[PDB]
Amino acid sequence: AALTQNPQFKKLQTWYHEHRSDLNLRRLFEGDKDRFNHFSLNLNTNHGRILLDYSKNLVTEAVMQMLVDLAKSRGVEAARERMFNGEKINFTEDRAVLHVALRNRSNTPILVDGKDVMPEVNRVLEKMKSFCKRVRSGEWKGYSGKSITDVINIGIGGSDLGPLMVTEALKPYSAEGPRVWFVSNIDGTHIAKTLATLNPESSLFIIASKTFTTQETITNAETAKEWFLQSAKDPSAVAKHFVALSTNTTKVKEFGIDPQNMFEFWDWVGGRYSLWSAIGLSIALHVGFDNFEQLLSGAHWMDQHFRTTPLEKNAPVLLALLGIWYINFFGCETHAMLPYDQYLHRFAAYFQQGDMESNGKYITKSGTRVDHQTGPIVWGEPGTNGQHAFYQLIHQGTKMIPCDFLIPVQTQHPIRKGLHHKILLANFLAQTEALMKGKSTEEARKELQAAGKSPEDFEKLLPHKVFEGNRPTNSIVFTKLTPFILGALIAMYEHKIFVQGVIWDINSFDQWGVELGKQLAKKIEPELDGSSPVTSHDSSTNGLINFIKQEREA
């Protein structure tokens, strides 16, 4: 009811229904000669630049204006201050949403129920700084008096994607640091394949769980612990090999970790927003706390930009609006994120949890059901691999797929006088050019004529070689991929997802769909036990259980 009842919203509907044909990229580029200048945003962090080029979008000035009007009218600005001021905008859980307090480099007091949270934030941070320095330097020794050579993080979901994504991306900054491993799936393979190369004497396990009760997280933790005690044999040896990142002390303690080894965070830190908290121990540990501090700073700059810049020229805002355009008006079910950077190979996946767990909702603030589309399906792989993979569909399939193209201008490995990056750049420029302009029948006919074939031959080939084009894209180009910028990049999308939720009137910070999967299987577990058949379910679920049992013996 909310969105579709909106005057500016309804106004867009009619213009769209009315001009859709007027929306051709090719022609739009004839019309305005500095289209580029009008649909581009240059941000300078003073530690590098980020160019947000949104010109190849089926969009005009009036549309942009109308889209800004929509955001204004739906409370984006004040929704935003509520977030920063520590109010509880997580309305179903009745929580504050304060990932931004975690990178609040200025230590401005942010209060929750009166109490400033910053002193707690900085405290856990200093604990992180010293723990890092001790482990990285070799002072912190293992049970046989050895130095740590491997750090092993155990957790899943929020406690998983961040650290991995970032470590994979900040690889170059890790020479002086110990190796990280990430075990997340319950699948015994995951834990089995890691330990069988580790030496317990120089290994360190981090149990990352906000509630410290996640099934798969906790049983991996125990399997690890059993493997460890076979060699150590002394229970107190545990204190030098296991640390925890949770909110529940009691549980931390019932698991046997020393309370001096617990690095805490708060219920106001959402899982899919926690890399900035204690959850990031693994990053700082592998890449140095200094660079971690730099990650947090980058996100701090963008937080500042989001909060104080007017909507017409506000990166996160723009990005959210161009998306609502594609989702609620053109109808596109997905959105591809395509980083032209091998280090960022898990970036897309991260936002899958990022965007999708946040915005795949259907109930309103009013308790009403949505009667419009919400969060899209987000996918991708780094380029140029993608091009040799699924681009054929983006170019000539029967569905529209808006895409984000990302790339750094300076590569961390300028081998062969920068020839490699050169080719990676050219490819990053032309796919979007081509996705724009396409190729008409005539264009291809002439080309065939030139290849010297003859119209009777190429009569049947021709159509297959035609490209319609007019497919939209964003291009995101930044100076170099360092901790700072990467901080700013993630924080950017974070805010994008936020503005959209506000406009769709949903809660971007709970995840009952997720909370439920965490209970759902509790009844199936004991039933698998015997070799006797189950009947307590649907014929499918039962059919399946029974195939399993008969088979496990095969």
Ligand X SMILES: O=C(O)[C@@H](O)[C@H](O)[C@H](O)COP(=O)(O)O
> Annotated catalytic sites, by residue?
357, 388, 518
209 is in an annotated binding site: yes
> Smallest gap, in angstroms, from Cβ of residue 55 to ligand X?
29
Q: Partners of 243 in the beta sheet? A: 206
Helix (H) or strand (E) segment spanning residue 501 = helix 483-504
What is the distance between the alpha carbons of residues 34 and 50, in angstroms, rounded to a whole number?
A: 19
**Pick from 174, 211, 249, 342: which binds ligand X (CB under 6 A)?**
211
Please give the size of the binding site for ligand X, defined by CB under 6 A: 16
d(CA 315, CA 476): 11
CB of 110 to a copy of itself, least distance (A): 26
Binds a copy of itself (CB under 8 A): choice among 1, 10, 36, 446: 36
- What tokens does 68 get? 């800004």
The CA-based dihedral angle spanning residues 398, 404, 408, 411, taken in that order and rounded to the nearest 10 degrees: -40
Please identify which residue in 60, 167, 209, 411 interacts with ligand X, judged by CB under 6 A: 209
Q: Which is nearer to a copy of itself, 61 or 126 (CB)?
A: 61
**Nearest approach, Cβ of residue 454 and a copy of itself (Å):** 15
The residues in 205-264 that bind a copy of itself, with binding defined as CB under 8 A, are 214-216, 219, 223, 226
Query: Could you tell me whether strands 203-208 and 150-154 are parallel, antiparallel, or unpaired per DSSP bridges?
Result: parallel
**Closer residue to a copy of itself in complex, CB, 171/240:** 171
Minimum distance of ligand X from residue 275's CB (angstroms): 11
CB 455 within 8 A of CB 477: no
DSSP letters of 118-153?
HHHHHHHHHHHHHHHHHHHHT-SB-TTSPBP-EEEE
Contact between 511 and 357 (Cβ < 8 Å) = yes
Consult the annotation and say whether 155 binds a ligand: no
By CB under 6 A, residue 225 contacts ligand X: no
Residues 433-452, one symbol each (x = binds a copy of itself by CB under 8 A, - = not), give: xx-xx---------------
> Of 29, 84, 140, 330, which one interacts with a copy of itself (CB under 8 A)?
29
Asked if 12 touches a copy of itself (CB under 8 A), the answer is no
Question: Does residue 157 interact with ligand X by CB under 6 A?
Answer: yes
Of 60, 90, 214, 328, the one binding ligand X (CB under 6 A) is 214
> Looking at 142, 158, 472, 487, which residue binds ligand X (CB under 6 A)?
158
Whose Cβ is closer to a copy of itself: residue 145's or residue 367's? Answer: 367
357 binds ligand X (CB under 6 A): yes
Nearest residue to 248 (alpha-carbon basis) of 260, 265, 234, 233: 265
Binding mask 497-526 for ligand X (x = CB under 6 A): --------------x--x------------
Residue 538 binds which entry of ligand X, a copy of itself, none, CB below 5-8 Å type-dependent: a copy of itself
CB of 176 to a copy of itself, least distance (A): 16
Of the chain, the end-to-end C-alpha distance in Å amounts to 56
- For residue 337, report the phi and psi dihedrals to the nearest 5 degrees: -115, 120
Q: Which is nearer to ligand X, 53 or 357 (CB)?
A: 357
Q: Alpha-carbon distance 407 to 344, whole Å?
A: 10
In whole angstroms, how large is the CA radius of gyration of the chain?
A: 26
Binding site annotation covers 167?
no
**Cβ distance 50 to 486 under 8 Å?**
no
Q: Which residue has the tokens 């809660």?
A: 507
Q: Please say whether the beta carbons of 149 and 203 come within 8 A.
A: yes
Instruction: Say whether 210 counts as a known binding-site residue.
Output: yes
Q: Does 35 bind a copy of itself (CB under 8 A)?
A: yes
Side-by-side strand order, sheet with 40-44: 40-44, 49-53, 473-480, 403-410, 334-339, 377-379
Residue 7 touches which of a copy of itself, ligand X, none (CB < 5 to 8 A by kind)?
A: none
x/- letters, 344..373, toward a copy of itself (CB under 8 A)? -----x--xx--xx-xxxxx---xxxx-xx
Helix (H) or strand (E) run with residue 410 in it: strand 403-410
Binding residues are 158-159, 209-214, 353, 357, 388, 518
Residues that bind ligand X (CB under 6 A): 155-159, 209-211, 214, 217, 271-272, 357, 388, 511, 514
